[PDB]
């Protein structure tokens, strides 16, 4: 669990990262401008309460639904309820376009999401005893052990005397034992007593390297999905490595093998788990066979907080012989989650954004390109305008400015061109 | 290996059951008439002397010879040395003729004698407590246990309460916890909370039979294949069940079976293997290939008392191109023990002979009869004179007597003749 690092989809945050949280006050109430966030003091307010109704574990097979046009913060407040829930908690945003895959299951891959969204908290201290043994009999048993780089002798306790009785051992042998009730021996185990004439033997371990005496400190942050990616391995290049169709490394075997570990962590009391959330954009394309195991998943009390978003008011089942339903939710799985309403920016309020996120990406840019790019915001989409600000700097740069004007921003949008307007022109 | 009892050849013995042991005094020397013995004194001395060589442990890859003819006291002075070496020792009499076997070889007969002439003296003292649990929590653990007809409540020391977290417990486990380094348990196991709608569970066992408290005392004195021909079923019956010409119930990986639990009790210090004697009749008749066993079985420390007796003077070897050694021992084996030679009986101590068996066997009889009987004693075997006093016995409580004389001995020559004599007539 120790080699076990996670590897988290930061493409999909990165349009967020000039987000810190949730501006809000001791009282409840929302700031003007605080945590990276610019008005919907209606919509940060209401999921601002969402969260306390975590804490209070009052959210009883319950989740909540963004309804709001594109662009209206809805992916931006999932991202802040995760933030505002505790430190270095699963977020998962997903889109419901995301769960129509060719090889897997439409649930297949809305599982291990659920896994990506549940994680670990690990807070073991250990104090190692490695090394070769040279017993000593007091009045309660002494024991030498001789390392890589270091020899030490210690009076055990009479705990561990009782331990070591139950699991055969003698002088010379390497050993792991622990104070933090511990036991592991390696009988007869030892690569100073071994000779060239067997190979095949294996029945010896080497001198461990450094100290016997070691300060072992595991504090690690993982989801339950980062277990089974570093287990299905028989790691650095796992990262950037994925070309293959079938993907046939994650068998419902080997998460069996994760499952009772982990419980045995929990047992223990060592690390404790913590479910996160799990955001759905396209909440709509969702079918209905996707919704009855979010029904049985909400039901779990180690399930995560499932915040869904739905950019359409009247929406057909998917997975239903054509029933239309509120934002395409069947009533069976709307009933279950509570609404918050995402309000559309005024022009005024869309400017007020684009000089955070020119801050944040390092953009330096003229108060009149602000208002002239605040224009396509309101004209076209808050994505869209924002957008513009990458290319716009490059244009500056060759330029030789560092401020980027209205002339540099008025050649963006003749270049990169938004999707409405680039279907029209070819008539 | 409380269930295994131990199974004896008795009527072997049962020639001897006269004979209480080797009498001799403080210094060494024979008594006239002791333990059931009559003369002689030099042959008797001789292995009064190799008692204190086992004792002393100078035995040193050495044994014992019997040179004697028929009838001289030699396989009486084997069950001496054994009734002189300690209390319930193995004592094993074969002849060289029982070797040749038509199923099993030569040595799978004489491996089989030789588990027959090793036990085990065990003293297992064990402070059981079984029954349910009841927990409570003090300052160092309090455990109420529920039997079939007790109930009982006990603070626990804090050695079991190390060793009770390792093996998960709950209320309402039968367990079974010993005070003599011992930990056992049995999760979530209970008659009383079994339900009558799972039969292929298995999962629960039932509330243990009398109080918690209970001192099992363990005395066994077993040979090593007495721990074979027990563990070989899958047993009052098998004192006379034996009708299976193969007898494929002993296979070589069972035997492996009782070696490594053998070795667990040695190693715990319960019960220690004591080496007994192993006695050779015919020794002359046994295969230069049984030799080399026994050459190789003599150096090993585990290795009982193998005591040989041959009543021929110069025999060929066999399984050797016809070469005629001393009693028919091999040179490399000859050496490898010493000879203790057996003296025949004249008239008058063959009487004395018969007074002693006739008071053991329970036939009264007059003065003049035994001087008859010992007539036979001389003219004819030892034996055959002593195989005269029950059918006599039966001639006389036919006659209405119970004392035997001469008329009623008379009659049991004329109807139990010897081998010889009963040759001679039929010309
Ligand atoms: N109130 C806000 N304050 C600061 N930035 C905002 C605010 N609302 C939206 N944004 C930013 O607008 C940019 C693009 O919008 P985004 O893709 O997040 O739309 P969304 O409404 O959050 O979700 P959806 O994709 O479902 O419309 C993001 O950088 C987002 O953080
Ligand atoms: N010295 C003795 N004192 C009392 N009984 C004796 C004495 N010597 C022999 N006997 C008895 O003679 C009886 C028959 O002899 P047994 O078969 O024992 O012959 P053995 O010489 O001991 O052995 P083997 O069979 O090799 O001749 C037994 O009951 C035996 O105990």
């Known amino acids: 669990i120790s080699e076990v690092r996670g590897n988290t989809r930061d493409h999909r945050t990165a349009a967020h990262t000039h987000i810190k949280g949730l501006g809000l006050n001791s009282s409840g109430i929302a700031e003007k401008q605080a945590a990276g966030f610019v008005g919907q003091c209606a919509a ?50 997903i889109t419901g376009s995301e769960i129509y895959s060719t090889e897997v299951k439409k649930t297949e891959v809305l599982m291990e999401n659920f896994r990506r969204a549940i994680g670990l908290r690990v807070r073991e201290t250990k104090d190692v005893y490695e090394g070769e043994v040279t017993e000593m009999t007091p009045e309660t048993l002494l024991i030498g052990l001789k390392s890589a780089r270091g020899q030490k002798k210690l009076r055990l306790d009479p705990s561990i005397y009782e331990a070591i009785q139950k699991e055969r051992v003698q002088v010379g042998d390497v050993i792991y034992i ?107 394309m969702l079918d209905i066979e996707c919704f009855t195991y979010l029904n049985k998943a909400l039901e779990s009390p180690i399930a995560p907080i499932v915040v869904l978003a739905s950019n359409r008011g009247i929406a057909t089942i998917r997975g239903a012989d054509d029933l239309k339903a509120a934002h395409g939710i069947p009533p069976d799985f709307l009933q279950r989650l509570l609404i918050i309403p995402t309000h559309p920016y005024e022009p005024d309020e869309i400017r007020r954004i684009v000089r955070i996120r020119a801050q944040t990406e390092g953009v330096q840019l003229t108060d009149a390109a602000v208002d002239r790019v605040a224009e396509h915001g309101v004209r076209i989409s808050l994505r869209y305008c924002l957008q513009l600000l990458a290319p716009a700097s490059i244009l500056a740069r060759v330029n030789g400015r560092t401020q980027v004007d209205v002339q540099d921003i008025a050649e963006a949008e003749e270049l990169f061109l938004d999707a409405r307007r680039s279907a029209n022109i070819l008539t």
């Open 178 to 284: 622990e104070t933090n009730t511990g036991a592991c021996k390696r009988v007869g185990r030892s690569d100073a007593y071994a000779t060239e004439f067997d190979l095949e033997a294996e029945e010896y371990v080497p001198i461990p390297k450094g100290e016997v005496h070691k300060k072992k400190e595991i504090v690690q942050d993982v989801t339950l999905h980062d277990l089974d990616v570093a287990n299905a391995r028989p790691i650095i290049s796992m990262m950037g490595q994925l070309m293959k169709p079938k993907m046939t490394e994650i068998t419902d075997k080997l998460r069996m093998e994760i499952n009772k570990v982990v419980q045995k962590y929990i047992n223990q009391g060592v690390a404790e788990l913590i479910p996160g959330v799990l955001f759905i954009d396209e909440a709509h």
């Open 44 to 93: 940060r307010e209401a999921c601002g309460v969402v969260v306390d109704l975590i804490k209070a574990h009052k959210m009883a097979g319950r989740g909540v639904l963004l309804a709001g046009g594109p662009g209206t913060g809805k992916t931006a407040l999932a991202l802040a309820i995760s933030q505002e829930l505790g430190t270095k908690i699963p977020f998962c945003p």
